[PDB]
Amino acid sequence: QPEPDMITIFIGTWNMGNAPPPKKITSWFLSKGQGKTRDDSADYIPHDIYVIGTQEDPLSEKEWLEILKHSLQEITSVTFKTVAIHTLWNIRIVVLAKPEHENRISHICTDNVKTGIANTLGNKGAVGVSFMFNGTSLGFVNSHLTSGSEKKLRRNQNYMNILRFLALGDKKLSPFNITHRFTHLFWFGDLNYRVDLPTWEAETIIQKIKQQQYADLLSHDQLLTERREQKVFLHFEEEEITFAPTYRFERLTRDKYAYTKQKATGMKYNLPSWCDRVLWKSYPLVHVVCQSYGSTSDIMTSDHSPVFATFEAGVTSQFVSKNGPGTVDSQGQIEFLRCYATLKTKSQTKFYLEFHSSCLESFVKSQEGENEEGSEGELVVKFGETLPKLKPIISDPEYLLDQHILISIKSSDSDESYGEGCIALRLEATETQLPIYTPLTHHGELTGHFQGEIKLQTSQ
Ligand SMILES: NC(=O)N1CCN(c2ccc(F)cc2)CC1
Ligand SMILES: NC(=O)N1CCN(c2ccc(F)cc2)CC1
């Protein structure tokens, strides 16, 4: 039975509004309703991995697992295995996989982060799961961010707190946060970003939704505008939104948006909004294609409609050769020529690089680079031809061209990362000097750039 080179992943996000679900929720797992929907001809084909994010979930883990498994079994006739379940207050993540994948999945991690302080600490935050699927690392974050049209800044802070403090994936990747630890990272939930239009425009917005004219609404979506201005979710992707706003509905119909201020809303307006989102970030030049992104029309127990997204995702095998793992393959090397980092920092310390990759036995520390002043005020750290020669565990091009090198630039004074990035080894040529580039981030904010050239030697 050959190892897969592609899998499909279902991502669900549903704010349940503290109400039990209806008896049938199969439309969610089938990607049927509004937006980019799945072909009917695929209905009996199970996804490889289902990741279900809930918010305001009133169920026990047992009660929700029974509904999820029985739903998938009705759809597929397959009995799914439970990879992971983790709940923080009423925020929950469930990971289910086809039974044929049980012995491909390992290194399962779960964590949560609580956002806010005192007042603002007690029901918002994120849960997460990570694991290895053969040679591929997968991360999944379900977050319920701060609510309210006038708190987009708070939501952006919640995002930075979750990505700093959620402890998933390989702990040896110590300079790297979750936005660098995974081949494929999916981040979803009730992100709670609103359509920022005057309250007096509510009926106009509803009109536009009834005509399926979303362009003038999406141009005011806070998640899209904040992302455009690099305030949040830097270097994440989101599929085009072609479904109606998923919030705020009158329960038991989809015919009405309930937007008016009420004692129950803290006298806040809830203009129709795309609260419920799925984004992703994959390593450079790894195959990832969104095949659905939409909302259900027939699940109406909550004031939110469920959102679905499906993805084709490139995966690699657990490679063994006669040499590595457990030794180097002298027929492999990675050389870095004419490299320099450009940093936004106003500081003056020396810097060195760390190179981390599953293709190395352990991470590699460089010598300090040479600081120069850039024309426009910047710090330029020159490495020239001084960077160590990296010694992969396996030289086979079938393995090595599928790998990635994570780079941290660290202060000699403090050993703190100033910037993290990622370089793909999916090169146009081997034994050839080729340009490489990554942006550098720290706490998921832009801190600079790393560029230069690479020369990759494989056994071929
Ligand atoms: N490395 C480990 O800790 N395990 C134990 C759990 N296990 C597993 C269970 C369910 C599933 F759906 C997929 C994988 C894999 C082996
Ligand atoms: N060249 C790139 O790396 N991107 C990614 C981000 N993207 C974008 C689009 C709309 C929006 F509202 C916010 C961000 C533009 C294309």
Q: For every residue of 82-108, which 3-state class applies, written as one string?
A: EEEEEEECCEEEEEEECHHHCCCEEEE
Helical (H) or strand (E) element with 278: strand 276-282
Q: How far apart are CA 12 and CA 52, in angstroms?
A: 5
Greatest Cα pair distance, the chain, in angstroms, is 70
Under a CB-based contact definition with an 8 Å cutoff, are residues 41 and 331 in contact? no
Cα(228) to centroid of ligand 2, in Å? 6
Nearest CA to ligand 2 atom 15: 228
Q: How far apart are CA 394 and CA 333, in angstroms?
A: 10
Pocket of ligand 2 (CB under 6 A): 224, 227-228
> CA gyration radius for the chain?
23
Q: What is the resolution of this structure in A?
A: 1.7
Helical (H) or strand (E) element with 382: strand 379-384
81 ligand 1 Cβ < 6 A? yes
Q: How far apart are CA 24 and CA 299, in angstroms?
A: 8
Q: How far apart are CA 8 and CA 48, in angstroms?
A: 5
Give the atom of ligand 1 at the shortest distance from the alpha carbon of 106. Answer: 1
The residue type found at 449 is H
Cα(68) to centroid of ligand 2, in Å? 34
Under a CB-based contact definition with an 8 Å cutoff, are residues 26 and 59 in contact? no
- Long-range CB contact pairs, 164-168, < 8 A, 24+: 164/443, 164/444, 165/113, 166/111, 166/112, 166/113, 166/126, 166/128, 166/141, 167/109, 167/111, 168/109, 168/110, 168/111, 168/128, 168/129, 168/130, 168/139
Tokens of 219: 């141009």
- Of 29, 50, 272, 247, the C-alpha closest to 142 is 50
Edge-to-edge strands, sheet with 105-114: 105-114, 125-133, 136-144, 184-190, 276-282
Q: How far apart are CA 385 and CA 459, in angstroms?
A: 23
Q: How is the chain split among helix, strand and coil, in percent rounded to 5?
A: 15, 35, 45
Per the entry, the structure determination technique was X-ray
- The whole-angstrom distance between residue 38's C-alpha and the CA centroid of its chain comes to 22
Mutate to test the pocket of ligand 2, among 220, 221, 222, 224 (most ligand atoms within 8 A of CB): 224
Cα(108) to centroid of ligand 1, in Å? 7
268 ligand 1 Cβ < 6 A? no
83 ligand 1 Cβ < 6 A? yes
Specify the pairing of strand 184-190 against strand 136-144: parallel
Under a CB-based contact definition with an 8 Å cutoff, are residues 175 and 185 in contact? no
